[PDB]
């Protein structure tokens, strides 16, 4: 992984992210939602677990985006958790949780769940 | 379980449910959200997995409530998944998923996640 992870990844819904996998487990880069404009670019940061692998396993990783930049503050953050599988059709398969800041009466409906697959293509 | 499960259960948020655990895995009863009025009572249905247990494990179970009755149609359903642990302080610890009917553009934010503990008290 590491070298395989670094680059640009696209999902099914139009989003892009660019990430560098740094040598001791660090992931850093930016997530852009849409349009093609500075206003949809947000910072990401995460970690991946580098492993000596003999059997074709995925590499486990996770990153967080807080949805605040200089043009938008959506009072929320998303985490994605999943694994990188390299090769011909490398993908990162993830499940994600999006939490919004709520009042304590609304806390029980603060968190959405879903899933994304990202490909290099 | 079976005999232990049948009865009334309360969660942290004010909700009540009454369930019968029938001999071959069936759960049936009603969920009432609040107030103390026919209008907050909804049908539940689920299953539990009966097991010969030698080591103090929970019993796995799950049920579904669709949020439509004669006074309300909220265009959604919740499933709870977890386990019953009997004894002095019997509880059912669960995680739940609530999906609302959406248009296909909004499908990605159709599903909330959270958790509830129910007790007999």
């Amino acid at each position: 992984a590491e070298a395989g992870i670094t680059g640009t990844w696209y999902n099914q819904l139009g989003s892009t992210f660019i990430v560098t996998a740094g040598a001791d487990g660090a992931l850093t880069g930016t997530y852009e939602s849409a349009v093609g404009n500075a206003e949809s670019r947000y910072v990401l940061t995460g970690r991946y677990d580098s492993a000596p692998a003999t059997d074709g396993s995925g590499t486990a990783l996770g990153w967080t985006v807080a949805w605040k930049n200089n043009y938008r503050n959506a009072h929320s953050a998303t985490t994605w958790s999943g694994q990188y599988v390299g090769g011909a059709e490398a993908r990162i398969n993830t499940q994600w949780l999006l939490t919004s800041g709520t009042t304590e009466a609304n806390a029980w409906k603060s968190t959405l769940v879903g899933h994304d697959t990202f490909t290099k293509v | 379980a079976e005999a232990g499960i049948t009865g009334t259960w309360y969660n942290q948020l004010g909700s009540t449910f009454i369930v019968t655990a029938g001999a071959d895995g069936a759960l049936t009863g009603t969920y009432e959200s609040a107030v103390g009025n026919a209008e907050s009572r909804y049908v539940l249905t689920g299953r539990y997995d009966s097991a010969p247990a030698t080591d103090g494990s929970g019993t796995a179970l799950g049920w579904t409530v669709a949020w439509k009755n004669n006074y309300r149609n909220a265009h959604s359903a919740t499933t709870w998944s977890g386990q019953y642990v009997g004894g002095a302080e019997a509880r059912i610890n669960t995680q739940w998923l609530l999906t609302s009917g959406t248009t296909e553009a909004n499908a990605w934010k159709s599903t909330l996640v959270g958790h509830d503990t129910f007790t007999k008290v």
Partner: peptide
């Protein structure tokens, strides 16, 4: 038009 969705 939450920043995680399409567009926005």
């Amino acid at each position: 038009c939450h920043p995680q969705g399409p567009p926005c």
